């Protein structure tokens, strides 16, 4: 039920009743969590804290910044009455990045707002792009529209209503609107030199390395001894891992990102039209131009993710539950 139950109940003592209903249902998911430690929350660990957010399995960082609040304020009041043996409270020491660590590993896709925020934390442009430009579509057979992207598409497109013409090993050419965000951040890529290790932050001597000189978005790195030509499928997998060592998750793939922007357009369309069915996965076909077999088979495929239960559980805060 509770784990230091007297102590626990001395605190919600002192909240209001509608408090009261938010901290209660913590400190009994909590509860399994502090019988394994045989220990309070009040005197967990920083890597305990986010082990013990994690177990309550949140979807999004809107609502893991929220629970941390919560427990702050229970941490606090705690230290004022000096029931714990450590002095300072270990939830305010959660850096911004330690944040992602406490999402849930049932987390599969990212909100669109998830995208934007992990974006201002990334200082390389390569880093960036790849993000954006999976998010919003670019992506072929092994990343090859993603791959063979240059400047030049970028710049036409810019021109173009923000139409690019994108390049395809197996079927070829295609169509994919996108944002300007997306076109100016793979304009600063395709001319970005360095690439900076651990997102800025590396720590030992050597701290950026030299890209190759070319006119494509993504760049090999200059001692893999790749030529000025596109790079390969691990190029991508490689910045994807790096961002993910960075926040320090587990669920981030080229796939699930792309279907993030799937899930994304589903939430713009059930906020006006209320419902999720087949016509809005036909419609999120042709806005993403999908490259597909055949288009009933792809609505099929869709029906895992593209779903009204999917889109309540990802963007609840937006939608105004």
């Known amino acids: 039920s509770m784990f230091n ?12 009743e509608g408090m ?79 944040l992602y660590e406490c999402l849930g590993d049932k987390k599969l896709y990212i909100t669109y707002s998830e995208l934007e925020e992990m974006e201002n934390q990334l200082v390389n442009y390569q880093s960036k792009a790849v993000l954006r430009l999976l998010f919003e579509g670019v992506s072929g057979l092994a990343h090859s529209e993603l791959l063979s992207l240059t400047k030049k598409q970028v710049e036409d497109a810019m021109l173009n209503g923000n139409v690019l013409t994108l390049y395809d090993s197996k079927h070829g050419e295609r ?17 970005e030199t360095k690439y ?23 760049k090999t790195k200059r001692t893999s001894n790749k030529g000025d030509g596109q790079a390969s499928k691990f ?3 490689n910045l994807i891992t790096d961002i993910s060592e960075f926040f320090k998750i587990n669920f981030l793939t080229p796939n ?3 279907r993030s922007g799937h899930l994304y357009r589903a939430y713009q369309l059930y906020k006006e039209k209320g419902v999720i069915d087949n016509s809005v996965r036909y419609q999120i076909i042709d806005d993403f131009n999908l490259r597909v077999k055949s288009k009933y088979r792809a609505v099929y495929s869709m029906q895992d993710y593209i779903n009204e239960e999917e889109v309540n559980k990802y963007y609840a805060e937006e939608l105004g539950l």
């Open 196 to 218: 900076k290790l651990k997102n800025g932050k590396a720590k030992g001597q050597t701290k950026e390395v030299f890209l190759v000189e070319n006119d494509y978005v993504v």
């Open 175 to 191: 169509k994919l609107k996108v944002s300007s965000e997306c076109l100016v951040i793979a304009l600063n890529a395709a001319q």
């Open 235 to 237: 190029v991508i997998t």
């Open 256 to 258: 699930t990102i792309v």
């Open 5 to 16: 139950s007297e102590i626990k109940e001395k605190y919600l003592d002192t909240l209001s």
């Open 20 to 98: 009261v209903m938010q901290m209660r249902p913590i400190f009994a998911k909590a509860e399994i969590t502090e019988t394994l430690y045989n220990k309070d929350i009040y005197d967990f660990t920083s890597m305990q804290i986010l082990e013990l957010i994690r177990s309550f399995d949140q979807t999004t960082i809107g609502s893991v910044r929220r629970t941390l609040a919560l427990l702050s304020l229970y941490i606090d009041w705690a230290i004022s009455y000096k029931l714990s043996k450590g002095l300072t409270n270990l939830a305010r020491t959660i850096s911004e990045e330690e």
